[PDB]
């Protein structure tokens, strides 16, 4: 109602503060991928396993070109 629109506002705050953390450390991810990894993290996911996929997807965007 109201607290769930404050929730919907606090999630747009959370992606922005994680975008700030993503840019100051100079990671490869942009804002569009960053909204997917958090959805993966709410269900529970191993970041050691996700990082091995992320270091291959971005190295396979120019191996199918």
């Amino acid at each position: 109602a109201a607290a769930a629109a404050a929730n919907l506002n606090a999630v747009r705050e959370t992606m922005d503060v994680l975008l700030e953390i993503s840019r100051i450390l100079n990671t490869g991810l942009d804002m569009e991928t960053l909204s997917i990894c958090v959805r993966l993290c709410e269900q529970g996911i191993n970041p050691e396993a996700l990082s091995s996929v992320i270091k291959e997807l971005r190295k396979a965007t120019e191996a199918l070109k």
Binding site: N7, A10, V11, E13, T14, V17, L18, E20, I21, S22, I24, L25, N26, T27, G28, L29, E32, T33, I36, C37, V38, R39, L40, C41, E42, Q43, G44, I45, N46, P47, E48, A49, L50, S51, S52, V53, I54, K55, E56, L57, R58, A60, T61, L64
Partner: protein, 99 residues
């Protein structure tokens, strides 16, 4: 969201392709993520936060080390996350120094 479509959704952000253009990369994602869908280590947010500070020292900046304290304050302030260790270890592990 189902995980099988969510990993495909990751594959469509990284590779700019349709969800049926690319299924080899999506197959490698289903290959790796499966049977390790839970973290393999003990976790707390505090240790990886104090290593993100160690990461900001490595790039020769200490003003962001005190800005990142308030950026991690906002995460505790909202409380809309399930795992705050996991995304932060991911963003730490994918880092790179510009030198």
């Amino acid at each position: 969201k189902s995980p099988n479509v969510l990993l495909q959704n990751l594959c469509c952000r990284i590779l700019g392709r349709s969800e049926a253009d690319v299924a080899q990369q999506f197959q490698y994602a289903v290959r790796v993520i499966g049977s390790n869908f839970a973290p393999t280590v003990e976790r707390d947010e505090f240790l990886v936060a104090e290593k993100i500070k160690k990461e900001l020292i490595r790039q020769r900046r200490e003003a962001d080390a005190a800005l990142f304290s308030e950026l991690h304050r906002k995460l505790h302030s909202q409380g809309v996350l399930k795992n705050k260790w996991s995304i932060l270890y991911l963003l730490l592990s994918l880092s790179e120094d510009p030198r």
